[PDB]
Amino acid sequence: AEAGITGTWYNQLGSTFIVTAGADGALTGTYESAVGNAESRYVLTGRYDSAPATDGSGTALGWTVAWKNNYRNAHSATTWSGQYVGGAEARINTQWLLTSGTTEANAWKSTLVGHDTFTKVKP
Amino acid sequence: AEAGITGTWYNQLGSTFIVTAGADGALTGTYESAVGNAESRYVLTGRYDSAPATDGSGTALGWTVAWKNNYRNAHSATTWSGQYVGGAEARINTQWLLTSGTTEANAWKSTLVGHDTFTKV
Amino acid sequence: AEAGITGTWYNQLGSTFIVTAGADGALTGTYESAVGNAESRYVLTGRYDSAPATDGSGTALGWTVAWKNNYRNAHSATTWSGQYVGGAEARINTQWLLTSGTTEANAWKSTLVGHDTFTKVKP
Amino acid sequence: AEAGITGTWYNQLGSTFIVTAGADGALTGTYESAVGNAESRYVLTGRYDSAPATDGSGTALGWTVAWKNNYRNAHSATTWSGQYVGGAEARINTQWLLTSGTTEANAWKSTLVGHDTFTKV
Numbered sequence: 001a002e003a004g005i006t007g008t009w010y011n012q013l014g015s016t017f018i019v020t021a022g023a024d025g026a027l028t029g030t031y032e033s034a035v036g037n038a039e040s041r042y043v044l045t046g047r048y049d050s051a052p053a054t055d056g057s058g059t060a061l062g063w064t065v066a067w068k069n070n071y072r073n074a075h076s077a078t079t080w081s082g083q084y085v086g087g088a089e090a091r092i093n094t095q096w097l098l099t100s101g102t103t104e105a106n107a108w109k110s111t112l113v114g115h116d117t118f119t120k121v122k123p
Numbered sequence: 124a125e126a127g128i129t130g131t132w133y134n135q136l137g138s139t140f141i142v143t144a145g146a147d148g149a150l151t152g153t154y155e156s157a158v159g160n161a162e163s164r165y166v167l168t169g170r171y172d173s174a175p176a177t178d179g180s181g182t183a184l185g186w187t188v189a190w191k192n193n194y195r196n197a198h199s200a201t202t203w204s205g206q207y208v209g210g211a212e213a214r215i216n217t218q219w220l221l222t223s224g225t226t227e228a229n230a231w232k233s234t235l236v237g238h239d240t241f242t243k244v
Numbered sequence: 245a246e247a248g249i250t251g252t253w254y255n256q257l258g259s260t261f262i263v264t265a266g267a268d269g270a271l272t273g274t275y276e277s278a279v280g281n282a283e284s285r286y287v288l289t290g291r292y293d294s295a296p297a298t299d300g301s302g303t304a305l306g307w308t309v310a311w312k313n314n315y316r317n318a319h320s321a322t323t324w325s326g327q328y329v330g331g332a333e334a335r336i337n338t339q340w341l342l343t344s345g346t347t348e349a350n351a352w353k354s355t356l357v358g359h360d361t362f363t364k365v366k367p
Numbered sequence: 368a369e370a371g372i373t374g375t376w377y378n379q380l381g382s383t384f385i386v387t388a389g390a391d392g393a394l395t396g397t398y399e400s401a402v403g404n405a406e407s408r409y410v411l412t413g414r415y416d417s418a419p420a421t422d423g424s425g426t427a428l429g430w431t432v433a434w435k436n437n438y439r440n441a442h443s444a445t446t447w448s449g450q451y452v453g454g455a456e457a458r459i460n461t462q463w464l465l466t467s468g469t470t471e472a473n474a475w476k477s478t479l480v481g482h483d484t485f486t487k488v
């Protein structure tokens with residue numbers, strides 16, 4: 001449901017995610033990371049699959065943040081892939097991939113993988 | 124490097140995607156796949172880092188496709204993270220995560236992972 | 245430290261891991277999963293990097309379980325990659341990959357990825 | 368299929384590994400890589416599923432290598448999960464996870480992921 005996803009969310013590292021889910025399955029917003037070579041806010045864009053199922057399944061979504069803004073440029077990008085679960089305690093559970101641009105030679109070590117869980121605070 | 128990301132790309136599986144790269148880091152276009160509970164075109168949206176570095180590195184980027192359109196709804200979304208490299212043969216090398224919406228009981232098995240290499244050939 | 249890793253551990257799904265760390269960096273034991281097409285115990289083998297650093301870094305380790313035993317055979321195998329962290333509350337935090345054998349055609353969907361955290365109970 | 372996993376395998380990077388497959392599901396041998404803080408041979412231990420299925424599927428397997436030997440200690444371990452396929456050209460297609468031991472502060476960035484394809488050529 002766009003509505004339930006729309007809002008302010010935080011994860012265990014202390015990062016802030018501000019998102020608006022549109023009618024057409026779109027996600028746009030900003031991300032404020034607490035870690036890495038990233039200073040301030042960064043623009044994020046994603047999609048979410050607007051017609052989930054009835055049942056108590058989660059809504060699948062994903063989004064991307066390129067770590068470049070007017071203050072910094074980390075030459076890397078992260079994509080988060082997960083599910084939105086609503087209720088009194090709404091959560092977004094994800095797995096992410098962080099890729100840094102590298103030379104051919106170090107490409108075998110350009111991607112990190114991990115997972116993040118977000119808790120909603122505001123709409 | 125340069126506009127170069129913009130265009131039509133193909134992968135091993137036969138999938139095709141057409142993208143437009145904007146001067147400020149945005150990626151927009153459509154994806155049509157060859158495998159899964161997918162049928163037709165789907166919208167894709169992503170980002171790329173508009174200012175790569177100048178030690179022949181690739182340009183980091185990522186994009187998402189929710190698998191729902193006017194014909195099908197597979198209740199899943201795929202994200203591709205990787206880097207673009209130009210030259211006589213430009214390619215995008217990625218690793219992807221495909222998550223399906225499940226009930227909590229099946230959450231442990233909701234995400235698949237793989238890799239895809241796209242070329243304009 | 246072999247000693248700290250040796251013991252009985254459980255994760256959030258309710259699975260049991262029994263392991264012995266040997267002097268030479270080896271891990272051998274048994275795994276009892278709570279989920280999947282897996283019934284009973286399965287043999288596990290791994291390695292752990294026996295000389296970590298001084299500092300409060302974790303000890304890197306990994307192990308494999310092939311889901312075939314005398315009662316079942318799921319034609320799949322999982323590998324867990326993580327770090328052991330000791331202290332009063334010793335934990336093993338991992339990320340795993342589950343691969344099922346498939347035909348060439350469905351190979352794009354043969355691997356699942358996720359994460360597990362284990363808590364020690366016994367030595 | 369059959370003994371077939373046993374032998375010397377090579378990957379794109381130049382890495383080589385020699386393995387012995389036992390009738391009951393065990394895999395043992397040595398790994399020598401071409402990249403990273405690695406120098407010489409390392410011991411590897413894994414498992415394979417000794418009874419694959421009879422719809423031309425691959426044989427699921429996995430193995431681990433801790434990167435410590437009498438010469439180096441990179442304080443990391445790599446696990447490869449994938450499947451073996453025989454035929455004129457047998458290959459092992461894998462995805463791997465490489466974890467480095469960190470302090471809690473750097474745990475978020477302790478694991479790399481990739482893919483490797485091994486052949487006996």
Ligand SMILES: N=C1N[C@H]2[C@H](CS[C@H]2CCCCC(=O)O)N1
Pocket residue numbers: 011013015033034035036037038067074076077078096098116475
């Ligand atoms: N909130 C989170 N921040 C870290 C993880 C995923 S991406 C990462 C921050 C990286 C910052 C930019 C960089 O260092 O490349 N979750």
Ligand SMILES: N=C1N[C@H]2[C@H](CS[C@H]2CCCCC(=O)O)N1
Pocket residue numbers: 134136138156157158159160161190197199201219221237239352
């Ligand atoms: N070109 C690719 N197609 C498959 C992989 C990643 S996304 C996937 C197609 C999935 C279609 C929808 C589905 O079956 O869930 N690469």
Ligand SMILES: N=C1N[C@H]2[C@H](CS[C@H]2CCCCC(=O)O)N1
Pocket residue numbers: 231255257259277278279280281282311318320321322340342360
């Ligand atoms: N304790 C755990 N069990 C599940 C995860 C990782 S492997 C998985 C169980 C799968 C059982 C066998 C199978 O279904 O293939 N953690």
Ligand SMILES: N=C1N[C@H]2[C@H](CS[C@H]2CCCCC(=O)O)N1
Pocket residue numbers: 108378380382400401402403404405434441443445463465481483
């Ligand atoms: N053949 C491969 N070599 C690299 C990847 C996965 S394991 C890795 C070598 C790492 C060596 C030790 C290190 O640098 O940490 N594939």
